[PDB]
Design a protein around this ligand. Structure first.
Ligand SMILES: Cc1ncc(COP(=O)(O)O)c(CNc2co[nH]c2=O)c1O
Ligand SMILES: Cc1ncc(COP(=O)(O)O)c(CNc2co[nH]c2=O)c1O
Lengths: 362, 362
């Protein structure tokens, strides 16, 4: 049987080099890195190199932290809740600015925060499917503790003006967090250029395992623990380290940046092929802008078919995809593992499935 | 070279059957279980069986939850912080009772909670190295939201009277949490017998991977998310599921209970051998009670040697162990993988190392 994975914005496959690098730490290198003996110290080089890859991948500096967490969602809840106690309860800066495009990890936590009495303003989405930096400018008040905008939308795949917002925030003295999970491995990421205080990522979106991610914390910025017990990760996030995954995610990030050119030049080419070969069906449009997008994502609506339906049908022919808010539209999410063969086949099976669904309509 | 691992209360080695069961989900079964297509649905049976093993392992009932978390420390911070908003801020029950023996995941979070204005009373440890259930009884007030006592001490390895406290709490209407990480795989665990509302475990203490654990939540007991974003785990803990680890931890727990008899009957026998063959050195005593202990742990002090020292020396001869509060004492932590050969050797190298350190003293 031959299947086609186009659900990469949902999760990706672990690169074999990632699997390989991790295996030893699930076999004999199973010491706890906190221990003082050989079983624990023996794991330090591996860990250190993995971390090196992470720092290097996002151009964090030695004086910054990249804290290992259990996933981006941990990262997000941590920034929001920590800024809550630090900035909102303790310094009275009881406002947060974010967007409506933000992953439920951000919005939902915000929802809880307003439940506690924070006022959060969710920036509305424009015609262009984007946000503009001036848009937060006329929302930052003396009460704003934090602005949080995602680096790229998980649904449409379009990049936001992170540098702009970075500059705004630098200027007006408000903490900046970017949820960058959709950015890693897809477009260059630079916390320095972004003037970010906080950045989130999750490994399984760039060919590492599910169940680990990271939060970048900028030098001398404080953030009260979400995991108290303060021994590991410079006391900012306690719990025995996930050695195998840490080593894997480090390799994963290395490979991701190493394939940044490929991502734009062929995965992007393939994405454009799927897209413009695909819009040759009647009555179909891509949801939002096609310029300021991540190379691997296309979100298409077909006029007179609910997104899900097309998904179920496509599944039957061994091709995986997801939905996305526009009724609902369908999201196709490529990766470095897809072939031209595969998307030719996709154009075929998609058009076929579309026209069949449309005419049994009557 | 041949090494001897006796640091099992710090972390354990993954059972090979655990490694084996997990491998497929790091290779081709890499779908995201939330997805609707074949890549996601294909993982449901595996997950469901893994969860079945967890429920079965702790005698949770179908109407209870066992929520996958990223480790026990997550579990602990979650119970404490959630009970904080639910019971303390919202119902005015601004007291918690716990012990001083509790892992830093519990105590440290408590420390933060008193920073916010909760009053926490840490029960003191007796002569017997234990706690008595009547001890919490004369500390539970109209303000008590929660009592938290660990099922077994990570340092001495001694069991606490969980049933007693369970009954007390049932009676007096206060939420009960037990951090059971040291109990799993070591002594029978029964949330029902324990009348627990909440129970924590971490897989890497019973031969699963580091970086996953669980929180048992009793039917109709509420607990506000620590991970908001409310999609996975019946909206109680959001973030893409850690498939490989979930499957592994399930196998891990199955094997742990399956070896409960062995644990008491041979690992315990080996532990007793190390212990009574070991106390034949002058000036040495085991820290606390030797009756109400987990089968695999011995914590010994040597009179006139700081624990660490003995640790460094023992490391040089390829034998791993840890310290523990009494100066400091040394903790030897066995598992189902240790052999009689190994502990004979240990008695040898320990006595040798002890007498050498003692006489270069002069
Ligand atoms: C009772 C107990 N609770 C919580 C933890 C924290 O576990 P985690 O969240 O999986 O990191 C440990 C680990 N105990 C020890 C870990 O290292 N040395 C120990 O004695 C523990 O023994
Ligand atoms: C931007 C962004 N933030 C956070 C998350 C949460 O990641 P986690 O903590 O690793 O589970 C996702 C995952 N995005 C999607 C996950 O599933 N479908 C998606 O579109 C994401 O795309």
């Amino acid at each position: 049987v031959q299947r086609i994975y186009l659900d990469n914005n949902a999760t990706t496959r672990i690169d074999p080099k990632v699997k390989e690098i991790m295996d030893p730490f699930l076999r004999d290198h199973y010491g706890n890195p906190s221990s003082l003996h050989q079983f624990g110290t023996e794991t330090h080089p591996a860990i250190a190199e993995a971390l090196d890859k992470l720092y290097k991948g996002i151009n964090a500096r030695d004086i910054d932290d990249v804290i290992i967490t259990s996933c981006a969602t941990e990262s997000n809840n941590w920034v929001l809740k920590g800024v809550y106690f630090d900035e909102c309860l303790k310094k009275g800066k009881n406002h947060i600015v974010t967007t409506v495009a933000e992953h439920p990890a951000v919005r939902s936590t915000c929802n809880f925060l307003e439940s506690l009495g924070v006022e959060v303003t969710y920036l509305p989405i424009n015609e262009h499917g984007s946000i503009t930096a001036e848009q937060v400018r006329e929302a930052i008040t003396e009460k704003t503790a934090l602005v949080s905008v995602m680096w790229a939308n998980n649904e449409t795949g379009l990049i936001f003006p992170i540098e702009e917002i970075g500059a705004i925030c630098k200027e007006k003295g408000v903490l900046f967090h970017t949820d960058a999970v959709q950015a890693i491995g897809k477009i260059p990421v630079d916390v320095l250029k972004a003037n970010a205080d906080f950045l989130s990522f999750s490994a399984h979106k760039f060919h590492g395992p599910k169940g680990i991610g990271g939060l970048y914390i900028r030098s001398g910025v404080g953030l009260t623990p979400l995991f108290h017990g303060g021994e590991h990760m410079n006391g900012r996030r306690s719990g025995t380290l996930n050695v195998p995954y840490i080593v894997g995610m480090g390799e994963a990030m290395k490979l991701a940046v190493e394939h940044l050119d490929y991502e734009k030049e062929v995965v992007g080419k393939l994405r454009d092929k799927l897209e413009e070969a695909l819009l040759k069906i009647p009555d179909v449009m891509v949801v939002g802008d096609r310029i300021h997008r991540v190379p691997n994502t296309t979100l298409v609506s077909v006029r007179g078919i609910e997104g899900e339906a097309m998904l179920w049908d496509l599944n039957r022919s061994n091709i995986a995809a997801s939905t996305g808010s526009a009724h609902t539209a369908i999201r196709l999410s490529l990766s470095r593992f897809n072939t031209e063969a595969e998307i030719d086949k996709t154009i075929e099976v998609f058009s076929q499935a579309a026209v069949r669904l449309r005419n049994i309509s009557s």
